[PDB]
Amino acid sequence: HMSLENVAFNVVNKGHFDGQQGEVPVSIINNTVYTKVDGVDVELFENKTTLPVNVAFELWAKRNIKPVPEVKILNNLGVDIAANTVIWDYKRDAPAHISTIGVCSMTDIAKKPTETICAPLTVFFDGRVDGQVDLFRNARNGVLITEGSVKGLQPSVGPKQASLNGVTLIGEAVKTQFNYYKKVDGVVQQLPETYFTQSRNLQEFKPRSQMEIDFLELAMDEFIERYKLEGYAFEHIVYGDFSHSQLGGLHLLIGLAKRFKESPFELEDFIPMDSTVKNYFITDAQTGSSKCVCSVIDLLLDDFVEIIKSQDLSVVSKVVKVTIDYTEISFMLWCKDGHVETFYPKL
Amino acid sequence: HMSLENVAFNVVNKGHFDGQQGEVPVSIINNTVYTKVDGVDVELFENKTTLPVNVAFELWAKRNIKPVPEVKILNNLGVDIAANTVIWDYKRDAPAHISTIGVCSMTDIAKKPTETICAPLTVFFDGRVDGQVDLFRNARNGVLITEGSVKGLQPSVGPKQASLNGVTLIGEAVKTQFNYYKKVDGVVQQLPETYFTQSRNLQEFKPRSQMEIDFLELAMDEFIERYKLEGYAFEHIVYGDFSHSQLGGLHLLIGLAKRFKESPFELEDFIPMDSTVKNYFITDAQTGSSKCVCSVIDLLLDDFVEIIKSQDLSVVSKVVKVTIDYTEISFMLWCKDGHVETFYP
Amino acid sequence: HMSLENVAFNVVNKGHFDGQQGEVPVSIINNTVYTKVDGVDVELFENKTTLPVNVAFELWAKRNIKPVPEVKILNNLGVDIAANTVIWDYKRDAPAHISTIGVCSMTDIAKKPTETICAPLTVFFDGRVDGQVDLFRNARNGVLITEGSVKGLQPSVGPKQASLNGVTLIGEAVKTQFNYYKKVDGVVQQLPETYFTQSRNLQEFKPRSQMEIDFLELAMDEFIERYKLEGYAFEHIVYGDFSHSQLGGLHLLIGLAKRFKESPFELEDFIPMDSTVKNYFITDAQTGSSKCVCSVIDLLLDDFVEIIKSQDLSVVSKVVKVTIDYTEISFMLWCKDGHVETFYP
Amino acid sequence: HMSLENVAFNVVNKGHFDGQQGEVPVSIINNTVYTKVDGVDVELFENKTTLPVNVAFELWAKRNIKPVPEVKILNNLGVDIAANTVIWDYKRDAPAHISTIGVCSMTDIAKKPTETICAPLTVFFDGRVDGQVDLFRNARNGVLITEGSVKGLQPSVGPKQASLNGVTLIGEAVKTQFNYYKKVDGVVQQLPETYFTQSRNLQEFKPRSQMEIDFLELAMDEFIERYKLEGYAFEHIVYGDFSHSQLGGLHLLIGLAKRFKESPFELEDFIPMDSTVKNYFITDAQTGSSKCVCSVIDLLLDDFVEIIKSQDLSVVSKVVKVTIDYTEISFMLWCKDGHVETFYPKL
Amino acid sequence: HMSLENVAFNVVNKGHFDGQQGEVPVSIINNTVYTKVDGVDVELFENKTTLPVNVAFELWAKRNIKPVPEVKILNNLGVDIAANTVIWDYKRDAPAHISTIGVCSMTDIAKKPTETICAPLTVFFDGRVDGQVDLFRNARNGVLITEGSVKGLQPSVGPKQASLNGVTLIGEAVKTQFNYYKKVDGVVQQLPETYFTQSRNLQEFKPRSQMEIDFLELAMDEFIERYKLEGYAFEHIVYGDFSHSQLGGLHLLIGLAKRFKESPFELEDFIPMDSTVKNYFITDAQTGSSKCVCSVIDLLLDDFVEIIKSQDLSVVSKVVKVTIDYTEISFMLWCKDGHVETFYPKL
Ligand SMILES: CN(C)CCNc1nc2cc(O)ccc2c2c1C(=O)c1ccccc1-2
Ligand SMILES: CN(C)CCNc1nc2cc(O)ccc2c2c1C(=O)c1ccccc1-2
Ligand SMILES: CN(C)CCNc1nc2cc(O)ccc2c2c1C(=O)c1ccccc1-2
Ligand SMILES: CN(C)CCNc1nc2cc(O)ccc2c2c1C(=O)c1ccccc1-2
Ligand SMILES: CN(C)CCNc1nc2cc(O)ccc2c2c1C(=O)c1ccccc1-2
């Protein structure tokens, strides 16, 4: 007996859908779900999705509450749909996938991922759930995560971090680093060598290497000296140039983090979604320096240094391709007289 | 297991809530309830009430589908709430009463009408349902209908007509004339002698007496002659005067019906609810004669004639009170030289 | 003390805003205004405009309830705004003009039409209201209607019909034919000689000449013979050709009216507004003949005949300009071998 | 002349409804009330209630702007409705009570609390308003607060704190500790002995005893030693256990406060209302330890210690009842071998 | 080819409308504009205006992204409309002006400011845009800003600060101090001598003089001694009196800033718009002292001192007028025995 009232009962009593029997009184108004508690209405859910309020509510209640891959990873791997779960996208406050399998009568295209309607879709399978490894083996198109070895399959080791209830973290009490596998048209793929973004935020940025600690602590000139980064235009690319009306560079999150601690600025996230590369409209409050489209990526600084030090610097401009989060990211490299002028990603 | 999806299953399979088990998929968008049929969304309900969409839906699904009193009667008798049913008001496309008893978890103030929260409210009880006569006897404030006698309780014979799924009718396959009873502060009240309005509509108006047939068929002068209605200003009150920019008279539905057949006009129902007396903004399409507030009542013409012929006509202006549909309706009577000038509710 | 609650009190008690003091309880939900009557919510107004619900409500309550020019006339004369009234557009269920003068604190650009903000706008003035003729004289841009002469001002006699509470009519109890005047940049303009459209509707179409009676009663061939309309392609233009997948002709309302009586069809009014020329998507239910854009005008047939009989027919194709409802309507005239092929607005 | 426009005039000119004459222009759209200022629309109110926008607006404008009991107290005492005021619930952004008396034509069931429609309802009366003590004496069902003695009536001394415009505070410039009285079916009640919750928040938590200061300053083991709390499982119940995927314990706000200062975590308030016991879905960002339903109460630590030290510890599991904020709160006590395993409230 | 989809393409690709050709898929729901990215809907804009969602979206996309005068300045100067730009009001999240010129087919009253429909309106002209100085010269009613001299016209030097993408700042990489000019009925006006508000915020308040540094650092009594402010009731007006239920004084932002650092309080901005004088409902969390209408202005403290020291103190009460931000602000001055009692602005 699946129902709006039963979903609400679960949310009230268990914090999420947990398959318990029961009903509470519910009111729907203003894209909002309320329940009655002691004669008054209490908000349980505000719909921010493009689905009907009651459907969005159910999908949210049925969200995966274990560590799951960040949505940017799933997107980059071509995932269309999940087997028997909902990946909730906390960046969009909406389901990561528009359809479901065995979750919700209004969004389900199928009850089981083996139905032929699923064949053309890349289905996400979670090896931590009994039976899902086998379903991946039978699926035409799919992506699988596991915590350990799968007999016969070569793994790709994924990022250290995963999302738990919208908190991106590196697990200590729980495992967040998965093995990844992928199948296309019934054939297992070799996933490419890749860097991974670090998924940090501007304000509570934690360094993850000695070089990052050095970057944060040292002044610009000493850092560049120590790591012998002369000619790589770090002053521009990483630290940023706030001297002109158009803000120069500032393409690495760690650089934004450093600046923010010194002097606050505004970041407009004008396409608010999870992605490997983010585009921001930045206004520096101290100087008035601004830029409409500032491309930003959170690479470990050491990774960024490896990338820029692995390029030929003998041409004015060219596109540099880098596998990051399993996708091909295009960077523009501008050089002059054998040194870098700038280097930035394209979204 | 009451639920949105179960209510929808009942509506889809049984046409209304009928206590069947089952669920269908539902989508709610704005004020509309949809169900999925073969991959597409089909509208089941558009909310026109001031309640939440899913609540209004349930109340509508649980509406009484037997003949029930017209809402104007219930309102006139001071009914606040119904015991274990929903009276759906088809004039408002909304519940007649905002709260319920034993119907819906979101609107219920009680599960049974004996709870002390119900004591100050006038609860409607339906004697056709087992147990409800006894509940009326124990209730402090209430209105009861029955199809037959209740031992010891003095009845008031109600209107001939009732509402069945929003159709007002005089039943042949079903009974629509009830006995009425009322209690206030624990004490049974004597309901007053009353006329009843006829609940007809302008376009499909059916006469219900020889006098009404005569009114519709005969020209003004011969009708007035035959029923000896000289000096009662029927030409004004009933037929209406369309000769000036302000429309004169036209206070009886039958008069509106006659004119409508001859020449169409616009009626704006600017307070769209069920009531004994209705107010309309009328514009006559043929002449341009109009009036912002035209008070209209559907009395049997014979009843209207009895009322107006039972007045003293020796005073310029006077308020005349008449019990109709159990309520006191005030009429203004204007006279001059021993004849009526006008008479309107 | 202007207020939502006071507007509602007026609507409830007087049918429209009438400047009475008082308040009733009001609820606003989405785009609907409700008032509380005996414990329940009754709808007073559903907002179909692009204004805020409470503002649209007030403008509607303050609508002009006298005969006023049809909106198509006001639009054709370039009217931007009204002085101290609201012209309600019943075709759009919205105000004819987005701003007001001396009506409503939320929409007013001025309290009096003499304020300099009004100077660039063509302000509508109603000579039936004290002071408005004088305001027109002082206004830089304006349109004036009156029921009689204004000393020194050369009149244009307007259409016979006007709109009274959304009913287009030729007044008998009230005057609906106005004199018109217009000023541009401080200078009175000579309004052109014009035909007027008749503002009839498909279903309740009434002929207004012997020729129109003949058209409706006679078969095609005898009508054309009697009025000697050979070579003017009336069979195409007026009667319509339903023989092919694309519907031919059918550009006069009277022709639509005749066919509708014989055999129903669908008309999609895909730009639902008042205008001199209307465009419809027509599907003929009997034959399946259809046309996405069928241009239709309601001219008195006699006027249409005068127009088409006053053309030179020696050129293949030509634009014919005709003043109708004070605006220049372009017609395409297609000829071949000295006869008309088609003629449409 | 009560009206939408008059309410708006009061809000604009006086900050709340204050009975002044006047009108401003108002627009209603999008569950929002706007007023026109110099040719442009300014938002005055966004409706988050289940009432009509214009009605919610009026009730909010007519909210009590003196210190008033927290809603959890009023709820716990069975209050249904207030006499001649509106208690605004700032946790729900809505009226605490669905009906009114002498406030608003759309919500009023009565103009005076003596009308017989009020008899079955528990009416809240404020002794600081002239006449209300007498109205309580005549009422069948009611709750009364005063600042001082009422002849003949034994008081219950309420919490130190009250709510002033949604700020919970202990008054210095104003009195916030009331005497409470209650009547049921025309009979004055003896209110029970009760603990009170402290109504603090996680981030700006202020200790209110030496023991709380000690808890915040000292490390776990020294605190437990000093207050001789061995065997009471404080390490679990108060400090929390973040070592496993399921977060253990953490049922006292002060424990949450301590952890939060050390290491931030996410709290989902999935039933956002005022209540003595709160249920949160917690995700610890550092470890990945989480729990869907973590029951949390803000008792003075000394009170909590008194409660746990006043229990028999000789049974595996049982329900412990405690009067808090005038209501009976059920706790589960789990023991083993004469020591506590865990102890937590139920909502 | 102007269109919803083209506006969205510009927002996605350029961060704002920049005249680029292209279209993306768009969904409109819930006063919200979404675009489709890789099979899912991403929010681009939430309409908080009283305009249609798609129109508000376009105006926002076409907002001026250079430093522009704060809206309070434009309002104070009587500006009705802007020539060929949109001034976005970030305080209201809406256009500063209801109509446009040469911006948007749905809001335009004209394509060029020379059309006669514009004659009665005060049109804002930006001298940094080619041709606009000349348009001001031909306009009947207008306000002009420039960065430098205009031949023949005497300038008024405006505030140091301007708004850049909703960030009020004093430019270093960009110019934010403009020359102002104004025309009424075809005649150039002499703008009055004026003080300017400083446009700071409570939490990140930066002093801009030695006196302000002293105010923030020194205790009350020493500050008053040093600047010889005895008898001017600074203890009341600037510092505030929290000793009674009604909060006394506290009319200068710097005073609020000082208090806030010591002890947080609640400020309800009940008319949320840009204005020279702001009215707040204040509740002090520490004491419970409150006031429904607390008028607050951010004057440089030195300016405030000059103003109060330039008044006659020999009458009980009177209105003091002060030109601030080009408008006449009325203050009430209350005196007794030759000293100030209080002094506060009226909104
Ligand atoms: C264990 N280490 C490898 C990294 C620990 N270092 C830091 N952790 C932080 C954690 C935070 O939540 C915020 C700032 C932090 C900072 C460091 C630094 O080394 C550092 C240097 C300069 C500014 C901030 C931090
Ligand atoms: C049993 N009789 C007393 C009523 C039968 N007479 C009529 N029935 C009608 C039923 C309809 O559905 C519509 C019009 C009706 C009319 C009569 C009339 O006698 C009469 C006279 C003039 C106009 C209409 C009707
Ligand atoms: C005063 N006369 C010029 C007009 C009277 N003639 C008609 N009046 C009608 C009034 C209606 O409400 C509906 C149809 C009508 C028709 C006529 C006709 O002559 C005629 C011919 C063919 C069809 C309908 C009508
Ligand atoms: C007057 N005393 C009884 C209590 C004063 N002590 C504290 N007040 C605080 C007020 C705040 O707004 C935030 C943290 C506070 C803290 C104390 C502590 O003693 C303490 C110890 C460890 C961390 C925070 C605080
Ligand atoms: C360059 N000087 C003229 C001003 C620099 N002084 C300050 N800047 C601040 C910038 C901030 O973002 C926040 C607080 C600040 C404070 C000062 C002070 O002098 C001061 C004194 C007491 C409290 C805060 C500040």
Author numbering:
A (entry chain A), D (entry chain A), E (entry chain A): 0 to 346
B (entry chain B), C (entry chain B): 0 to 344
What does the paper say about this structure?
Despite the rapid development of antiviral vaccines and some approved treatments such as remdesivir and paxlovid, effective antiviral pharmacological treatments for COVID‐19 patients remain limited. This study explores Nsp15, a 3′‐uridylate‐specific RNA endonuclease, which has a critical role in immune system evasion and hence in escaping the innate immune sensors. Structurally, SARS‐CoV‐2 Nsp15 forms a double‐ring‐shaped hexamer that consists of a dimer of trimers. All Nsp15 subunits in the hexamer can be occupied simultaneously by substrate molecules, whereas disruption of the hexamer significantly reduces the enzymatic activity (Deng & Baker, 2018; Kim et al., 2020). The catalytic triad, found in a positively charged groove, is formed by a lysine (Lys290) and two histidine (His235 and His250) residues (Kim et al., 2020).
The ligand binding site of Nsp15 with TAS‐103 is found on the catalytic domain but opposite to the active site, in a cavity that is formed next to the α6 and α9 helices. The compound interacts with the protein via interactions involving Phe204, Lys205, Pro206, Ile212, Leu215, Glu216, and Lys260, with an interface area of about 240 Å2. Next to the TAS‐103 molecule, we observed extra electron density corresponding to at least two additional TAS‐103 molecules, separated by about 3.7 Å, appearing to interact with each other via π‐π stacking. This density is located in the free space created on the tip of the nsp15 hexamer. Although the two additional molecules could be modeled into the structure with lower occupancy, we excluded those from the final model. For the TAS‐103 structure, the structural differences with other Nsp15 structures are negligible even at the region where the ligand is bound. TAS‐103 binds to Nsp15 via van der Waals and hydrophobic interactions with residues of helices α6 and α9 and the loop upstream of α6. This area is located at the core of the C‐terminal domain and shapes the entrance of the 10–15 Å wide channel on the two sides of the Nsp15 hexamer. Due to the loss of activity in l‐cysteine buffer conditions, a non‐specific protein inhibition, for example, by the generation of reactive oxygen species, cannot be fully excluded for this ligand.
